[PDB]
Amino acid sequence: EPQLLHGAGICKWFNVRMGFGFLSMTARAGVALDPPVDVFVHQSKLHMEGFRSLKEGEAVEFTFKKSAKGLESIRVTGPGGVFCIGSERRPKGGDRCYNCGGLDHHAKECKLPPQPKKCHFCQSINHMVASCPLKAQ
Amino acid sequence: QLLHGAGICKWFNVRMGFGFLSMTARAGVALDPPVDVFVHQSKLHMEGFRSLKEGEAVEFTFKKSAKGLESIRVTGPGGVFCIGSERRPKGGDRCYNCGGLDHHAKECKLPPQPKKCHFCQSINHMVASCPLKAQ
RNA sequence: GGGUCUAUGAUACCACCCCGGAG
RNA sequence: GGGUCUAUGAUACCACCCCGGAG
Ligand SMILES: [Zn+2]
Ligand SMILES: [Zn+2]
Ligand SMILES: [Zn+2]
Ligand SMILES: [Zn+2]
Secondary structure, X not given: OOOOEEEXXXXXXXXXOOOEEEEEEEEEOOEEEEEEEEEEEEHXXXXXXXXXXXXXXXXXXXXXXXXXXXXXEEEEEOHHHOOOOXXXXXXXXXXXXXXXXXXXXXXXXXXXXXXXXXXOOOOOOOOOHHHOOOOOX | OOEEEEEEEEEEEOOOOEEEEEEEEEOOEEEEEXXXXXXXXXXXXXXXXXXXXXXXXXXXXXXXXXXXXXXXXXXXXXXXXXXOOOXXXXXXXXXXXXXXXXXXXXXXXXXXXXXXXXXXXXXXXXXXXXXXXXX
């Protein structure tokens, strides 16, 4: 019966030039999943500005559905609906707003609702950048 | 009598201050297989912070040591300064002839030097055909 | 993201530090 | 040294181009 589901997790891997990858879903409809499950992701489904991709291990929230080939992402964002980070293989020019992740402005000029602090490197809500285990690789 | 050789930097550990040279020429004779020659940062003819980049072209004097072969003085082709590792980038204008920061090519005290590959300092090719830059 | 690295000698695998309504 | 890379959908394995001139 349910066609549209909520999930959360991290990017498992993303091939930047092929424009696709997989998400490791660690929570489905707000329930922890152990073992995690793979959810397919296409670049067209990434909520972010400009060139779309994911960096390995970045924290994500998404809607998904069952497809003929498995589980397919509908819309992928960072925690709280913010923009995804993207791969370090395609660096971008501008600074990112610490509140929404947008390129336009800084957090003091942000018109968006207040967001919790997220790791500047992987967007995880559980740690800050100085203690990032992903950055420490 | 000190020995003369030529080759490339095999590898250089920037923070350990040492590496090895791959000697492909000894006393004007081609060596195949090449032989490793130890190199310490103190023996590099270059200004400021001393290191080598992997694959850069070298000319050197060396001697036999208890541990193997040891560099006495290492330079780029024709006695010019070594390049050094991209891990420690330097700032400032370089002389187009010798690579010094002190002056410009017109004021250079070294004889006129042939064109050397911008990437590895080889006298045998230019940067557009550099096999080292290829990867 | 930002900063400072002029000295680990023998086949290594690349130093240290700072930054969370902040630029 | 300089420039360009906004579209390869299902467990992949990461695109190129220009410059030998001179302070
Ligand atoms: Zn914002
Ligand atoms: Zn993190
Ligand atoms: Zn000169
Ligand atoms: Zn070359």
